[PDB]
């Protein structure tokens, strides 16, 4: 409703770096709010795409940002009569970023890995990795829970059980209030998908440069399955956390599996031990139900509600015609320890191929009426297909069916304006939560400041 679309602020990165593919607000130990931005196609030292991260200070005019430096050199360690290899070329560092406390977690989901033993190998595969930093102190650490030292012959003599070679850890990420990092790995267990969890504090204290293979005893990975319904489901394509069991000591996970059960798509709510609480099945095949998931209390009853995006949902129209527009589903949590019912609200895109629902950012209470609100991205929506972001306000019965405000892309065609979103943080300290919108196609980020309601 009350986001200011006249006086925006633009941050920009190098050409062709996909600056703005991922973003997040960051608060240093003093409370100063900055913007962390991932640019997964940034050039590295070998003049080869490796990715990169930028830490943008808040300035009303914006401009260019200083880099958050990370080690981009390929590593090799000859230990235990084996040879360990890390390949950072085209790793896409910054394809996902998340901030917690005074720590920034940036992940390279396509970083490759291999282990050689005489004439055999483990296969050069994308296990992914995440790079952790503490900007003020300069501390650095890494976390790559899918690296292994098992030769390829063993996986074959074994029907490819517990195969974490293609995890792509860091594809999606999130941190709990306690400081427990949760990484989505859609390629884990031969593209079944898995989650990896470990406290941030232990990741730092157990990491040393050059080791490449180290143990994190407090880590927790999800489990493999023989169930063909999870095959090629990309479980962990999207991840979130929230409170869905009434117990405030436990933290529940929200996992998106957009191709679960033969591209039907699903979303699952779990506990900290990966025991499935609820499962929300897709509505239409290949709609990519579960591409994005969000958690926020929209009706103001204190219970987190669930929002699922299906960017490729085809809407039924006159004369048996289907039109791909995208759709978002709203699930209100019921009072007490009961199951989440049918969708409480269906939001459907308008522009053909607009992909309404690609991203869903909770905004907090934007208009300060008492109900949290959300923003939905259609990166190729709007009448010109240049991208569009729509704001929906929370009400006592859920969300409002029609948007309270529509932000048209200030960028040219192909910017993917809205592909990444983030709100619910007052960056200019005016008392209203603000929204930052990524547009990696234009290598830029736009900041929308919320102003008092007219």
């Amino acid at each position: 409703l009350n986001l200011d679309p006249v006086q925006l602020t633009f941050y920009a990165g190098p050409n062709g770096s996909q600056f703005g593919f991922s973003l997040d607000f960051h608060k240093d130990s003093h409370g100063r709010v900055a913007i962390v931005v991932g640019a997964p196609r940034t050039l590295g030292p070998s003049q080869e795409e490796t990715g990169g991260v930028f830490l943008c200070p808040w300035r009303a005019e914006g401009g260019q940002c200083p880099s958050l430096l990370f080690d981009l050199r390929d590593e090799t360690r000859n230990v235990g009569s084996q040879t360990l290899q890390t390949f950072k070329a085209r790793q896409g560092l910054g394809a996902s970023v998340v901030s917690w406390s005074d720590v920034i977690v940036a992940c390279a989901p396509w970083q490759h890995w291999n282990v050689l033993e005489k004439t055999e190998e483990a296969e050069k595969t994308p296990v992914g990795s995440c790079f952790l930093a503490q900007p003020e102190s300069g501390r650095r650490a890494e976390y790559s829970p899918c690296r292994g030292n098992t030769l390829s012959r063993i996986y074959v003599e074994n029907d490819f059980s517990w195969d974490k070679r293609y995890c792509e850890a860091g594809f999606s990420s999130v941190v709990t209030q306690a400081g427990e990092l949760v990484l989505g790995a859609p390629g884990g267990y031969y593209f079944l998908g898995l989650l990896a969890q470990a406290p941030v504090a232990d990741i730092f204290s157990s990491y040393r440069p050059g080791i490449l293979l180290w143990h994190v005893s407090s880590q927790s990975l999800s489990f493999d399955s023989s169930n063909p319904e999870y095959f090629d489901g990309y479980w962990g394509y999207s991840v979130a956390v929230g409170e869905f069991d009434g117990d405030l000591n436990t933290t529940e996970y929200v996992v998106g599996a957009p191709t679960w059960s033969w591209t039907l798509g699903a979303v699952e709510i779990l506990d900290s031990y990966y025991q499935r609480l609820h499962r929300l099945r897709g509505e239409q095949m290949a709609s990519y139900f579960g591409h994005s998931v969000a958690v926020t209390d929209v009706n103001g009853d204190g219970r987190h509600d669930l929002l699922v995006g299906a960017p490729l949902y085809m809407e039924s129209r006159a004369d048996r015609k289907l039109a791909e527009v995208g759709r978002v589903y709203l699930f209100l949590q019921p009072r007490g320890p009961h199951a989440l019912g049918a969708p409480s609200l269906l939001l459907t895109g308008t522009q053909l191929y607009g992909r309404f629902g690609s991203a869903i950012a909770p905004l907090g209470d934007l208009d300060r009426d008492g109900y949290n609100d959300i923003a939905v991205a259609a990166p190729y929506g709007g009448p010109s297909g240049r991208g569009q972001v729509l704001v929906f306000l929370g009400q006592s019965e859920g969300l409002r069916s029609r948007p309270s405000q529509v932000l048209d892309s200030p960028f040219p065609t192909g910017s993917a304006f809205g592909f990444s979103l983030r709100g619910a943080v007052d960056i200019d300290d005016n008392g209203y939560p603000d929204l930052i919108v990524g547009a990696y196609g234009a290598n830029q980020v736009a900041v929308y400041r919320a102003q008092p309601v007219v």
Partner: antibody, heavy 119, light 108 residues
Framework: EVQLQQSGAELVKPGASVKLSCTASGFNIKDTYVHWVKQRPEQGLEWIGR????????KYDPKFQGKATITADTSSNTAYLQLSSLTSEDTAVYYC????????????WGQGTSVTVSS | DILMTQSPSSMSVSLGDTVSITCHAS??????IGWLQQKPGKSFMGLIY???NLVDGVPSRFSGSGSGADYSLTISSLDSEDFADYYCVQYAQLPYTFGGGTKLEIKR
């Protein structure tokens, strides 16, 4: 706290077989590699072998092949070292070892088990 | 197999001294070395792993250094408990091999 609680001291006859144990306390034996080390006063420290208790695969020094047999049981959370066709040369102290962080390290050590072979 | 030549076999030193222990390998091992301590009549304790990194709980007066095939463990300001045996172990290749060991004795 990581503690490796090995079996009690063993006293056996030449040509018999003994089975040493290394029960884990404070963690799961399934976590890391588990090694076995032999210590003699004159000869010093010798590496026997390792085992991955998660899958059971083992590695040995060619010297101890046929004499040492390493196994593990995740149920009872214990790793074992069995010695066969014992000799006065097998009279030594035996330690089980696991790493702290580095996969290939030797950081945590049990208290050790003393073996004496005499008739 | 890789041979670990650890020198010297023993040294008689006093409290507060800064002593060093070399450990030479048959070939390069790219910092894949660890140092161990066995207090008299007790079991082993981890000091260093991967050449320079200290095991959790080990005082900072210990420090490992070196590269290639030559490595050194250094103790600054010797303490009463430091009088014990010290061994180097390499894990660059299987089988793992240990050094001859060094015994720290009190000088008088």
């Amino acid at each position: 706290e990581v503690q490796l609680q090995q079996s009690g001291a063993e006293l056996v006859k030449p040509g018999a077989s003994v089975k040493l144990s290394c029960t884990a306390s404070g963690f799961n034996i399934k976590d890391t590699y588990v090694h076995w080390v032999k210590q003699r006063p004159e000869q010093g420290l010798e590496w026997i072998g390792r085992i991955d208790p998660a899958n059971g695969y083992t590695k040995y020094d060619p010297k101890f092949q046929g004499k040492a047999t390493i196994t593990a049981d995740t149920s009872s959370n214990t790793a074992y070292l069995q010695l066969s066709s014992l000799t006065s040369e097998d009279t030594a102290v035996y330690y089980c070892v696991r790493p702290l962080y580095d996969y290939y390290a030797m950081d945590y050590w049990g208290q050790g088990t003393s073996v004496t072979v005499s008739s | 197999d890789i041979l670990m030549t650890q020198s010297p076999s023993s040294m008689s030193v006093s409290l507060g001294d800064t002593v060093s222990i070399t450990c030479h390998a048959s070939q390069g091992i790219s910092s894949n070395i660890g140092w161990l301590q066995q207090k008299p009549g007790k079991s082993f304790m981890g000091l260093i792993y991967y050449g320079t990194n200290l095991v959790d709980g080990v005082p900072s007066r210990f420090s490992g250094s070196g590269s290639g095939a030559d490595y050194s463990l250094t103790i600054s300001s010797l303490d009463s408990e430091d009088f014990a045996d010290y061994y180097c172990v390499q894990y660059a290749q299987l089988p793992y091999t240990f050094g001859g060991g060094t015994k720290l004795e009190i000088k008088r």
